[PDB]
Amino acid sequence: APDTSVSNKQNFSTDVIYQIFTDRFSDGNPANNPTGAAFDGSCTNLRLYCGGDWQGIINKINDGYLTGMGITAIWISQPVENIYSVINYSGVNNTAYHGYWARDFKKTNPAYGTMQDFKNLIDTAHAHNIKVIIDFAPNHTSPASSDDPSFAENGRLYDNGNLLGGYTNDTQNLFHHYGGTDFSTIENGIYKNLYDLADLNHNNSSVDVYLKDAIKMWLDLGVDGIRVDAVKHMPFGWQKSFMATINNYKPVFTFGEWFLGVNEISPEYHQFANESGMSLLDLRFAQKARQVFRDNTDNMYGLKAMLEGSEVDYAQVNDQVTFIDNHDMERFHTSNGDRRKLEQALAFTLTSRGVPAIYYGSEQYMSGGNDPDNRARLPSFSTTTTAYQVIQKLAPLRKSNPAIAYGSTHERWINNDVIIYERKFGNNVAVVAINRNMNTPASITGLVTSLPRGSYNDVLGGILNGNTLTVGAGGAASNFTLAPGGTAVWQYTTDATTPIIGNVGPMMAKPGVTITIDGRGFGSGKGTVYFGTTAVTGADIVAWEDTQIQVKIPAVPGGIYDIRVANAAGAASNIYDNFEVLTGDQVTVRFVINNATTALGQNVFLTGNVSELGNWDPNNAIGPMYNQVVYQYPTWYYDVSVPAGQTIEFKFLKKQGSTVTWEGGANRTFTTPTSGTATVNVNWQP
Ligand SMILES: [Ca+2]
Ligand SMILES: [Ca+2]
């Protein structure tokens, strides 16, 4: 099917995501509304249920509100059954309207709807070529006090109605009991509770297996994407085996949220996007976009430096979900903010690299501070706002113009207030000019683009005061004045004649799994895809057409491979690197090593003989290992994804700067389980 098909669950760069807080969107079925203290139909107490549900979203797809806007993906609240308690937090009453306080990941939250309502949502969405992304929050269940078992539902977890256990009297250790996080270290935020949420223990095999069976059930119901909550608070080794469960079963686009504040740049954030098997919410983009377009705490050079820099730092920049606000920040539009600021930031996001997400109600200029104020019921379903029209005009270019969906980003003109950038993919071009100065026009002289000669009409139809671009020979545009607040989008599309790979999904899977390579110029005739030097042809190429190839990963050793497509005529595409072939199915094993005393700046790491352990390479060793919460120094521990069912050989090592200190003795062997988890408890071999 083409790259733009609704059935492309692996890659979303051609989509525009509309992020819905299900409860705050439309109440299509009043009969499923919570009653009593848990409900507020006026939705003035934004911590209670207002009543919005999956029938309300179905209705808004049906009547054209969402499809009129050009939305092709909706991201909705976590669908699973949540606790029913109204928790009074210091006077304010609070409910699970947000879907985050799970009690059974196998059932639906009935306020949102029944399992049949969810299937109706999936089918209505798909029939209108809308992909459905769900939140999934496998880090915790719900507010719990083991000291007070009567608080809330004591974090209880059920498995399709069957109680597995609660927070008080957790003899099976389904949960962590280390206190709450102060967020001082990543380790601390992983193993201690996030606020008061009963922290699930993923090293418990029945939690591990439950959560993996639960996500498979949602994959079976036809969801197209997953937004994993609190990725910074779950073990990276466990989330990589969770990603492998999805990708080796039914790979769908998965991304997580790892928060970064303004100008905070975290290597681990990038290492997570680059190595987990899921992409991330592009906080770096969101924060700089708000700095340039909203707060004016940075100028167009900051914007340029972020776009330039992130194209390098994210191994797959086309998989990061960009946005200008979401549930976790103040609404972009303020009370005294010019609406043109929102409108440009939305035009910027919709034409930029990545997977754009529009937070519901943006097209209705909702303002509001932080939680819960950024989650009000959206006030109107007016289809004639300028913002609605900006999305309506620009969001279909994601499907129609390969350059916007996959293209590189080239700044062609810039000054403190103006950026003109080019998106280029093969011969497809889009050029976006933005003048954030609402007062002074910009004299653009000397603009060169890759557009062929012609008179390009602004795709926005002048609604953001854009203009026609007259391009002459060699892509030189005739000089023009960009209006105060001017935003214009000019584009040209043709066929790519040469294979160009714009995106591949999933990026991590074992041999035998079909991956989806999207791009242009593949041709209709089946050609070759290379993983490294290994050619895959014939029956192993499940599907070949000009914009999408589905190919089975060849039985190559685990490790990282460059992918390249050769079309039928032997012409080869660009390399799409960093593809991880897994040694096989994954299980998370906790490795614990005692008596590994280290000097300052020296940490314990683990490597071994499979790619998952870095194939004996100190530079790729797993770690730094932890040593504070579950076990304390000199015992170090770490949860690591390793191939299931086999004997791995491994060794621990200490590294301080460029010095690797290996354990002495023979290599350690361990036979991993076929499912579930295991703990390897060993002592440093001198
Ligand atoms: Ca309802
Ligand atoms: Ca946790």
UniProtKB/Swiss-Prot annotation:
The keyword Metal-binding applies. It holds the Pfam family Alpha-amylase_C. Ca(2+) 2 binds at N139, I190, D199, H233. Keywords: Calcium, Disulfide bond, Glycosyltransferase, Metal-binding, Secreted, Signal, Transferase. Ca(2+) 1 binds at D27, N29, N32, N33, G51, D53. GO terms for molecular function: alpha-amylase activity; cyclomaltodextrin glucanotransferase activity; metal ion binding; starch binding. The active site is at D229 (nucleophile), E257 (proton donor). Disulfide bonds join C43-C50. Residues 203-406 are annotated as: A2. It is an enzyme of class 2 (transferase). Residues 581-686 form the CBM20 domain. Its EC number is 2.4.1.19. The record marks D328 as: Transition state stabilizer. Transmembrane segments: none annotated. Residues 139-202 are annotated as: B. Residues 407-495 are annotated as: C. It catalyses: Cyclizes part of a (1->4)-alpha-D-glucan chain by formation of a (1->4)-alpha-D-glucosidic bond. Residues 496-582 are annotated as: D. Residues 499-580 form the IPT/TIG domain. Gene3D superfamilies: Glycosidases, Golgi alpha-mannosidase II, Immunoglobulins. Residues 1-138 are annotated as: A1. Belongs to the glycosyl hydrolase 13 family. This is Cyclomaltodextrin glucanotransferase. It comes from Bacillus sp. (strain 1011). The gene is cgt.
